[PDB]
Structures are given as C-alpha cells and as structure tokens.
Amino acid sequence: AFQLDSRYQDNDGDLIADIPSDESKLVDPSTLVFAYTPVEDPAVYKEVWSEFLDHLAETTGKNVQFFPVQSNAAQIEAMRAGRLHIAGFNTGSNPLAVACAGFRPFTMMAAADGSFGYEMEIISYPGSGVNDVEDIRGGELAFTSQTSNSGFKAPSAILKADYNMIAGEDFEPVFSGKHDNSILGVANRDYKAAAVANSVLNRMLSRDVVSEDQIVSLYKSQTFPTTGYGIAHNLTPELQEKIQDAFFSFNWEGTALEEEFSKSGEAQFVPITFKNHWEVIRKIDAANGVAYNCR
Numbered sequence: 001a002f003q004l005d006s007r008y009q010d011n012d013g014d015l016i017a018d019i020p021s022d023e024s025k026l027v028d029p030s031t032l033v034f035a036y037t038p039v040e041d042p043a044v045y046k047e048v049w050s051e052f053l054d055h056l057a058e059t060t061g062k063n064v065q066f067f068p069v070q071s072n073a074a075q076i077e078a079m080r081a082g083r084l085h086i087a088g089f090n091t092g093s094n095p096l097a098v099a100c101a102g103f104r105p106f107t108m109m110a111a112a113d114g115s116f117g118y119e120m121e122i123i124s125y126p127g128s129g130v131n132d133v134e135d136i137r138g139g140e141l142a143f144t145s146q147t148s149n150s151g152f153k154a155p156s157a158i159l160k161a162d163y164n165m166i167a168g169e170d171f172e173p174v175f176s177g178k179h180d181n182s183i184l185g186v187a188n189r190d191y192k193a194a195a196v197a198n199s200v201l202n203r204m205l206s207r208d209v210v211s212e213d214q215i216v217s218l219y220k221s222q223t224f225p226t227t228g229y230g231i232a233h234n235l236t237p238e239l240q241e242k243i244q245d246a247f248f249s250f251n252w253e254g255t256a257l258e259e260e261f262s263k264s265g266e267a268q269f270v271p272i273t274f275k276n277h278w279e280v281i282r283k284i285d286a287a288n289g290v291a292y293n294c295r
C-alpha cells in the first residue's frame, strides 16, 4: 500500500514518480545540483565526489554544484522544492524521498562481484559497562535521525520485537544527527550505546576518524541495500538519460571515489529497482508506523 504524494503520477505502477510529458513541467537547469547523503560531515565527501562531478558535467554539458546538505530532512525538502536534482539518499530515506520528493532511484554501489549491502550494528566503547544488547536496559541509546534505517527504524523494531525494549519505557533515546556523530560520541564516551551503519563505521575507521580500540560491536543486523542514487522526476528525459550514463561510465580506477568507497567494499554502480531492492526497507518503515505524510 505504498503511496506517492498526490502531486506525482505513477501510470506504470513501479511506485516512483513518472517523468512528466507536459514540457512546461520539465526542467533543464544550467547548473545541476548534486548531494550525497549526510551520514557523515559532507566536508568528508567534497573531494571524494569531485572528479565524479567533473565527469558528470562533461557528460551532461552542464555546470555541476556539490550541495553539502547536513540533514536528511533538508535533503528531501530540497529535492521536493526543485533545488536539488541528483542525490544519493540514505537507505532509510529512499521510500520517503520517492513518495514526497519525486526521487527516481536507479543505481546503488556494489562490490566487483555484484554483492552489495551494509548492516546496522549496535556499538559501545570498551569498558563502558554495556557488554551486550540487554545491558542497554535502563540506560540511553543514541540514534541518528528518524529517517535513518540503521540509525533509528531498524534498531527500534529489533529491540521491541526481539529484546522487549521500547523507547521511553526500557531505555531513553537520544539523537546525534548523523552516523559520524554517534560513532564519535561512542568513541569519546559520550554515548554508552548507539545504533549505526557499519559501512560508515568502517570508512571512518579507515580514515582514522576513530580507532579500532575505541569501538566494540554488540549486534549486527541482516543486510540492507546501501545508499540509493537517483534523479528528480521532472528533469527532461534526455538529461536524465545522460545523468544515468555518467554514473555508469565513470572510471573509478585511481580516483578519490574508489579510495573512499573501497573501504566499505564498493567498486561499481549497479542497476536497482525501488520496488525490489527497497521492499525490506518499506517493511521496516511500516513496522515503525511511517506514513509518508508529505504534509
């Protein structure tokens, strides 16, 4: 029963907003605005995407601008409002971005053999006194933001279903804003427990943002699709095809993109469909009562 906002049409039944055929509704911007997902300080990813965005500019013939958005809500609103044209949305926000911002997802990173994904992990710091999930009872649990799968919705569902633990009764929730804030907060002993994306954790460890001896894992979830990449529904069809081509034609070898994302096992972009690959996420959304009320 997934529903797009009534400002979009879904004539072909693939659950994503159709490209308009009224030419007055299409946009052909002279500057394409791109945003990666704020799982971490976007300053970390500015140079990571730089060469990729140069290739995108050459492929599309447009100027390209990196938008260092700081929260999921701001990123969703920017695409809904027409200011953001191409984005990677965090896994947990793809259904909301599809429904309320007209996001058309088409690709996801994968390993060289086509395997993909990340898991939620619940982490503490060594010596915290929190040595398994059950030890969280009566204490605080750090979440990232309410649109996060691994940072809020998946751990809330797992704790309620498998550990008989609900926020406000069995633990007190706190919100850090970002995976990196949660991971840093655990490493610095601000948080005794946090639910985080282990892909982000591994790249932060590789970049020496935190050290291995500062973090202990207490739980690892099932595997989820990673960040979904896509386009605002109302760019001209010709431009959308060129953007997709730019994603698949970019040569990763020797680039800052490969240097970063090889640290969570990625090597390429592969096609996905929202209907298939995000089914597990829509179910976790429904288990948390998510409505997709765009307001």
Ligand SMILES: O=P(O)(O)OC[C@@H](O)CO
Residues within 6 Å of the ligand: 037, 039, 089, 090, 091, 092, 093, 118, 147, 148, 149, 150, 151, 197, 199, 225, 226, 227, 228
């Ligand atoms: O914050 P979540 O929703 O778990 O998304 C992280 C995911 O985008 C990592 O690839």
